[PDB]
Structure 1
Amino acid sequence: PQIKLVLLAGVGFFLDAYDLFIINQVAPMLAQVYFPKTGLPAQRQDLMKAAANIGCVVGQVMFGVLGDSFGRKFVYGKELILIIVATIFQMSAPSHWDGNRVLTWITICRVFLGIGIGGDYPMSATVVSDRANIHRRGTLLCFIFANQGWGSFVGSLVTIVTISGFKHRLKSGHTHDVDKAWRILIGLSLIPAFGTLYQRLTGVIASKKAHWQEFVAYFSTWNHFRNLLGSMLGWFLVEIAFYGINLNQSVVLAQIGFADVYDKLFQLATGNIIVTALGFLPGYYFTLFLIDIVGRKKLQFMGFIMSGLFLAILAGEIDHIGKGPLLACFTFMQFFFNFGANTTTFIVAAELFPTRIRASAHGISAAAGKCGAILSSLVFNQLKAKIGTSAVLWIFFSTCILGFISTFLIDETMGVDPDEKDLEERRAR
């Protein structure tokens, strides 16, 4: 039946989101081993966490050109072996290496990982927006997207289960074993990755120029232009805050009160699991249960404006008030990222556009998102040192208000067939 396919994409999303966000759980493990007396250098950490997103855009452009050049049959398996191989290369960095060299190893692998994650990334959105042609398409997209929570959560659960498995060995003085853990965090993606590898297996310029002509004609009209503009902005703007935060959720929880060797790692994994269990994850399900009742915009407004509120509260109060209030707001924000703009910018970018031009607009929006993702991903930790976390949160707040303001450019997509609207638009003229 139709069911088995959407699960596989979810597991693909889970693996990407796992692979994407597991870096959030992996980065602190790298610090304790290779940089115990100081922290991970800012530019290298940004590049590493953006690396998957940078490779994610190069992946979706390269696996876009090859996918367009030689069809779907050419790209489907090769991306997963690429993230498996990139996972395996990433998973098996030499242990006797200098810290800076290990990081650069992982980034490049995470680019290729991102290139592989960049393959299947927009390709898991299209397959079910085309298929349904029914009012209940949004619940389905968010369900697969919610695996972004499970990827972040299971990565979070794997982390506490991993760390609590190494409990006694660490307390007895064998402090280097944490290096085994982060490979396990990444490597455990191989279980579904090979599981998925098993399951996945078990006139070129003339057309490109003609498609470019229709695309230019369509998005040269205001009521059509603004929707791509708002989609790019909303996705661009939220992925600034969303991946700024979710690739660095562990960094934010370290300014909040969650920061011996085991005690530290387990507490951070507890804050991560709390936030992702209580906020990041259920926010997808509050979105899941309300998109087809409340609408994408009001949730994006709320998501932007409330995550903006909580970003404004975080920005305003982070250096002045206690852990609990912040953790709630951060969980409220994470809740209102996924119960809001992070989820809706993914959905709205998929739903706005008639089929005849959808592929470019979503790729440009996702690229814009990855641009916003890589922008914050590329610079989140550098800005944190140059201007402070509160200032960045105000930026995320402003991007939420700009996300809020830019959200006005968008049409509501609940219950609308974009193809019948295009046909009636023309039969009227």
Structure 2
Amino acid sequence: MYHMKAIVIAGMGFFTDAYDLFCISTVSKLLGRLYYQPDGSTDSKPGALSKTANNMVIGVALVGTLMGQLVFGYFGDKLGRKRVYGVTLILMAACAIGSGLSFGSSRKAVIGTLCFFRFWLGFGIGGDYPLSATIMSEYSNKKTRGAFIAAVFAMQGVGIIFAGLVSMIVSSIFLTYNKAPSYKGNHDLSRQMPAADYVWRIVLMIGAFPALATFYWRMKMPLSMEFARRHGLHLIGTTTTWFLLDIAFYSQNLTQKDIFPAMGLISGAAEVNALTEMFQISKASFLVALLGTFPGYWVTVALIDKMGRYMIQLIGFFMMSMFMLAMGILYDYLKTHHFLFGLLYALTFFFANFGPNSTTFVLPAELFPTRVRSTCHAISAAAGKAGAIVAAFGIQKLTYNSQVKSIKKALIILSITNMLGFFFTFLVPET
């Protein structure tokens, strides 16, 4: 009756991963409104990060996480479980706080420090294996095995919820004291710079506390011809089914500052303050993740073994594609109604969480002989991190601050990617 405590101690590594990677989307507008907005000519919406700057700020963490995964996986055998667990976690608390500090006042200095201190955030987020180190080693007892792997992976949803929650509470707390007219009013005081300079710092520095909690909760606790013919097709299928999942999940959570302001749920950009828009997007993301992410994880836990591993992934990817095409080709009607689009987004997240989001990393575990299981797991993790990379340095460009045509095109490519993942799923049978 107290095993959920154990699941939290197991999945705090994913909790911090989620509220280290998805805490930058709620403040990415602010980092442009404050430091990247010229104080003159007031032409468009409040000036935000440029396409290159936004892509970089979003994706240095994922570049660092892929680098950390590779380096700490190919060199993490001379040491481990304490010396690769007190290093990455301490990094994810030192450079996490450093991400909230600046080397100056220039917009190329604060952004430079932020990118530099998020690269090492990714470095920690990388070679630190959250569950594959502990749970995947045995996977035994044949009693809620998948229902426990999914149970401890459900903490990613809690991480996203907590990211949205801390952003929302910080924005509301700092907003109550300072009220300023919208950007349509005083084009200079809308930035609220003296106080708004200490919100994207608090939101980004709070992420160190989960790293400390994980550190404390874990300190006190006690390729040849043979494999090519055996599982070569299985290996490529397992890698690609995950590579085509991060491209759809990280592009769904990392583009949360563009889709809603285009259609409802948000007051756009140039009719609210700096803090006000941040609070609005934080509330939108938090509500969508609460309705979409967490119930998906719970249903996966409840029905992982009743359904299995083939049919669940198949239906998850097919419904990915169907609901995404609905969110696509029927774009105008969703811009008309501010509720059908929200329902569609929530169900996309729900079927992501219920679908292959919590299954792709288990395929390497329950496949291949133990002689090479670690190598295939590492290569699949590399494929997934490359998927995240192309999610952040990819479709993100196709969506950011663009017209209606570009957003619809990006949704079309995302639906095509999910359908391609659906075709590639029929390569890893479960008996």
| Fold shared, TM-score > 0.5 on shorter chain | yes
The structure whose residues are more often helix, as a share, is: 1
Conserved in 2, the CA contact under 8 Å of 1:46 and 1:380? no
Structure 1 pair 229/65, CA: closer, same or farther in 2 (3 Å)?
closer
The counterpart of 1:264, out of the listed 272, 277, 290, is 277
Helix, strand or coil: the match of 2:48?
coil
Q: Which amino acid aligns with 2:91?
A: L
2:342 is aligned with 1:327? yes
Structure 2: runs of 5 or more not aligned: 38-45, 181-188
Structure 1 pair 295/29, CA: closer, same or farther in 2 (3 Å)?
farther
- Give the aligned partner of residue 254 of structure 1: 261
Cα distance in 1 for residues equivalent to 2:115 and 2:226: 38
Q: Which amino acid aligns with 2:207?
A: S
Q: After alignment, is 308-317 or 130-139 more displaced?
A: 130-139
Give the TM-score of the pair, scaled to structure 2: 0.86
Conserved in 2, the CA contact under 8 Å of 1:143 and 1:288? yes
2:57 is aligned with 1:48? yes
Conserved in 2, the CA contact under 8 Å of 1:22 and 1:151? no
Cα distance in 1 for residues equivalent to 2:310 and 2:419: 13
Cα distance in 2 for residues equivalent to 1:175 and 1:62: 42
Shift of 1:389: 1.7
CA-atom RMSD, angstroms? 2.3
Shift of 1:94: 4.2
Cα distance in 2 for residues equivalent to 1:384 and 1:411: 36
Cα distance in 1 for residues equivalent to 2:160 and 2:7: 19
The counterpart of 2:137, out of the listed 130, 140, 153, is 130
Structure 1: runs of 5 or more not aligned: 203-214, 417-429
- Give the aligned partner of residue 216 of structure 2: 198
Matches within 5 A, 1:394-409: 394-409=412-427
Shift of 1:357: 1.6
- Give the aligned partner of residue 143 of structure 1: 151
Q: After alignment, is 251-260 or 4-13 more displaced?
A: 4-13
2:77 is aligned with 1:68? yes
- Give the aligned partner of residue 23 of structure 1: 24
* 1:47-101 CA-partner distances (Å, limit 9, x unpaired): 3222222111111111123312444443111111111121021121246231x43
The counterpart of 1:278, out of the listed 273, 291, 312, is 291
Conserved in 1, the CA contact under 8 Å of 2:73 and 2:378? no
* 1:198-245 CA-partner distances (Å, limit 9, x unpaired): 34444xxxxxxxxxxxx3244311x61222111111100011111111
2:319 is aligned with 1:306? yes
Q: After alignment, is 333-342 or 353-362 more displaced?
A: 353-362
Q: After alignment, is 252-261 or 267-276 more displaced?
A: 252-261
Shift of 1:179: 2.7
- Give the aligned partner of residue 424 of structure 1: none
Conserved in 1, the CA contact under 8 Å of 2:33 and 2:47? no
Q: After alignment, is 142-151 or 314-323 more displaced?
A: 314-323
Matches within 5 A, 1:127-276: 127-135=134-142, 136-171=144-179, 175-176=192-193, 177-202=195-220, 215-221=223-229, 224-257=231-264, 258=266, 259=268, 260-261=272-273, 262-276=275-289
Q: After alignment, is 331-340 or 169-178 more displaced?
A: 169-178
Q: Which amino acid aligns with 1:409?
A: L
The counterpart of 1:97, out of the listed 87, 101, 106, is 106
Conserved in 1, the CA contact under 8 Å of 2:255 and 2:399? no
- Give the aligned partner of residue 372 of structure 1: 387
Structure 1 pair 346/254, CA: closer, same or farther in 2 (3 Å)?
farther
- Give the aligned partner of residue 186 of structure 2: none
Q: Which amino acid aligns with 2:121?
A: L
Structure 1 pair 123/196, CA: closer, same or farther in 2 (3 Å)?
closer
Structure 1 pair 220/288, CA: closer, same or farther in 2 (3 Å)?
same
The counterpart of 1:392, out of the listed 398, 403, 410, is 410
Q: After alignment, is 327-336 or 172-181 more displaced?
A: 172-181
Shift of 1:265: 2.3
Structure 1 pair 390/351, CA: closer, same or farther in 2 (3 Å)?
farther
2:305 is aligned with 1:292? yes
- Give the aligned partner of residue 113 of structure 1: 121
Q: Which amino acid aligns with 2:418?
A: C
Cα distance in 2 for residues equivalent to 1:79 and 1:157: 25
Structure 1 pair 353/165, CA: closer, same or farther in 2 (3 Å)?
farther
Cα distance in 1 for residues equivalent to 2:332 and 2:114: 33
Cα distance in 2 for residues equivalent to 1:43 and 1:6: 39
Q: After alignment, is 234-243 or 250-259 more displaced?
A: 250-259
- Give the aligned partner of residue 207 of structure 1: none
Cα distance in 1 for residues equivalent to 2:201 and 2:294: 24
Helix, strand or coil: the match of 1:75?
coil
Conserved in 2, the CA contact under 8 Å of 1:42 and 1:381? no
